[PDB]
């Protein structure tokens, strides 16, 4: 099917926080693209809201370029430059084992993406391996962040007024990577995006997390059981047998005040110093690059 007069819509490659993802073609420029379709007659319309967030992020390192946004037949449409596999897919493909070097390469960029998003007055609130994609081709060394479906302003663009402290709030993101505060029902802010990244990095290190695969009656009960496990697992127990840097990072995030601007620089320098002790070079040879 034609889309925006110059895009041909391919096959469904997967699914977003809302809407389905297709792998299409920019017929005119001969480039493969990604196309998010959302039903026009949907009760909870978002794509246009999401689009405006992607538009504010344009020109950022590790932000996918919008090609086109429109309505066509039954569908609202966003067309992005095509990106590669997610870190969840690359991790599955690497038998759920990343070398310390890959974890440190990823962590350096991922902190930087989260910092760029915070600089544009938004929190992500669904930091998880699925929402980081590697580029293709010459961009194969770049971690991209995607999916602003659950994202939200934390400060007014002009006044930089932080949102107010609120409690009694639905766990909206992914339970596995949620901050301890998020489980307590506190409004997500910058520190929470970074805590989540912290649980994502330890997931990369361990192959899983201790609160992963908990049985219960309902989703509601499972979340409580995850909260209970997270809060009763000390950070030094989670990170036992891994470099102290992972523990130091999570401790620093758990220390951050609701409205604190995090020291992104410090946290990058944390893993950079360890990178240098380990004698690794920043040559962007990830584990999946070594497969043959
Ligand atoms: C349990 N299993 C079955 C579910 C796991 C979830 S999944 O669906 O397999 N995960 C992948 C789906 C595609 C990917 N993705 C999600 N949204 C966009 C997107 C595309 C266009 C757009 F305008 C806005 C956003 C993409 C995506 C896919 C490929 N290239 C991309 N260039 C920019 C986004 C993107 C995330 C990774």
Check if 88 has its Cβ closer than 6 Å to any atom of ligand 1.
no
Q: Is the CB of 114 under 6 A from ligand 1?
A: no
C-alpha count within 13 angstroms, C-beta hemisphere, residue 79: 22
CB 67 less than 6 A from any atom of ligand 1: no
Question: Which atom of ligand 1 is least distant from the CA of 19?
Answer: 17
Contacts 24+ apart (CB under 8 A), 232-238: 238/202, 238/209, 238/210
Q: Is the dihedral of CA 9, 10, 16, 20 positive or negative?
A: positive
With beta carbons less than 8 A apart as the criterion, state whether 40 and 77 touch. Answer: no
From 14, 49, 52, 127, give the residue whose CB has the most ligand 1 atoms within 8 Å, as the site to mutate.
14
User: How many whole angstroms from 166 Cα to the centroid of ligand 1?
Assistant: 31
Please state the residue numbers annotated as binding site for ATP. 13-21, 36
The verdict on the CB of residue 65 being under 6 Å from ligand 1 is: no
- According to DSSP, the residues that pair with 66 across neighbouring strands are 80
From the candidates 26, 108, 126, 287, give the one annotated as an active-site residue.
126
Resolution in A: 2.6
CATH fourth-level superfamily of 85-290: Transferase(Phosphotransferase) domain 1 (1.10.510.10)
Atom index in ligand 1 nearest the CA of residue 146 equals: 34
Distance CA 245, CA 247 (A): 6
- Return the residue whose CA atom lies nearest to atom 27 of ligand 1: 34
The finding on whether 147 has its CB within 6 A of some atom of ligand 1 is: yes
Distance (Å) from CA 137 to ligand 1 centroid: 18
Q: Alpha carbon of 62 to those of 109, 113, 154, 291: distances in Å?
A: 8, 7, 21, 24
The DSSP code sequence of the chain is -EETTTEE---EEEE-SSSEEEEEEETTTTEEEEEEEEETT-SS--HHHHHHHHHHHTTSTT-PPEEEEEEETTEEEEEEE----BHHHHHHHTTT---HHHHHHHHHHHHHHHHHHHHTTEE-S--SGGGEEEPSGGGTTPEEE---SS-EESB-TTT--BPPP--S----S-GGG--HHHHHT----HHHHHHHHHHHHHHHHHSS-TTTT---SSHHHHHHHHHHHHHTS-HHHHTTTS-HHHHHHHHHHHH--TT----HHHHHHHHHHHHHHTT---S---GGGG--
Q: Is 78 in the pocket of ligand 1 (CB under 6 A)?
A: yes
Q: Could you tell me the CATH superfamily of domain 2-81?
A: Phosphorylase Kinase; domain 1 (3.30.200.20)
Domain chopping of the chain, boundaries: 2-81, 85-290
Q: Is 74 a catalytic residue?
A: no
Neighbours of 110 (CB within 10 A): 21
Closest CA to 129 of 153, 149, 147: 147
Q: Which of 57, 65, 80 to mutate to test the pocket of ligand 1 (most atoms within 8 A of CB)?
A: 80
> Cα-flanking dihedrals φ and ψ of residue 162, to 5°?
-55, 145
Cα(15)–Cα(149) distance, integer angstroms: 12
Sign of CA dihedral 283, 288, 290, 292: negative
How far is the centre of ligand 1, averaged over its atoms, from the C-alpha of 144 (Å)?
12
User: Which atom of ligand 1 is nearest to 66's Cα?
Assistant: 23
With contact defined as beta carbons under 8 Å apart, do 33 and 72 qualify?
no
Query: Does the beta carbon of 145 sit less than 6 angstroms from any atom of ligand 1?
Result: no
Nearest CA, atom 16, ligand 1: 16
Q: How many CB atoms lie within 10 A of CB 112?
A: 16
| Centre of ligand 1 from the C-alpha of residue 270, in Å | 31
CA distances from 197 to 26, 153, 193, 194, 282 (A): 34, 19, 6, 5, 20
């Amino acid at each position: 099917l034609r889309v925006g007069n110059r895009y041909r819509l391919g096959r469904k490659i997967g699914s977003g926080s809302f809407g389905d993802i297709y792998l299409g073609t920019d017929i005119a420029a001969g480039e493969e693209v990604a196309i998010k379709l959302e039903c026009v007659k949907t009760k909870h319309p978002q794509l246009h809201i999401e689009s405006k967030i992607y538009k504010m992020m344009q020109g950022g390192v590790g932000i996918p370029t919008i090609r086109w946004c429109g309505a066509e037949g039954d569908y609202n449409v966003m067309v992005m430059e095509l990106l590669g596999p997610s870190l969840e897919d690359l991790f599955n493909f690497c038998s759920r084992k990343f070398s310390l070097k890959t974890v440190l390469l990823l962590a350096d960029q991922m902190i930087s993406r989260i910092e760029y998003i915070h600089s544009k007055n938004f929190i992500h609130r669904d930091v998880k391996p699925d929402n980081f994609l590697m580029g293709l081709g010459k961009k194969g060394n770049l971690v991209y962040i995607i999916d602003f479906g659950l994202a939200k302003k934390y400060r007014d663009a002009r006044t930089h007024q932080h949102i107010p402290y609120r409690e009694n709030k639905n766990l909206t993101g992914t339970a596995r990577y949620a901050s301890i505060n998020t489980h307590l029902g506190i409004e997500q802010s910058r520190r929470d995006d970074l805590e989540s990244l912290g649980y994502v990095l330890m997931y990369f290190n361990l192959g899983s997390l201790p609160w992963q695969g908990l049985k219960a009656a309902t989703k509601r009960q499972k979340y409580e059981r995850i909260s209970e496990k997270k809060m009763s697992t000390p950070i030094e127990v989670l990170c036992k047998g891994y470099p102290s840097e992972f523990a130091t990072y999570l401790n620093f995030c758990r220390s951050l005040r609701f409205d604190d601007k995090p020291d992104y620089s410090y946290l990058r320098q944390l893993f950079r110093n360890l990178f240098h002790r380990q004698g690794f070079s920043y040559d962007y040879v990830f584990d999946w690059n070594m497969l043959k």
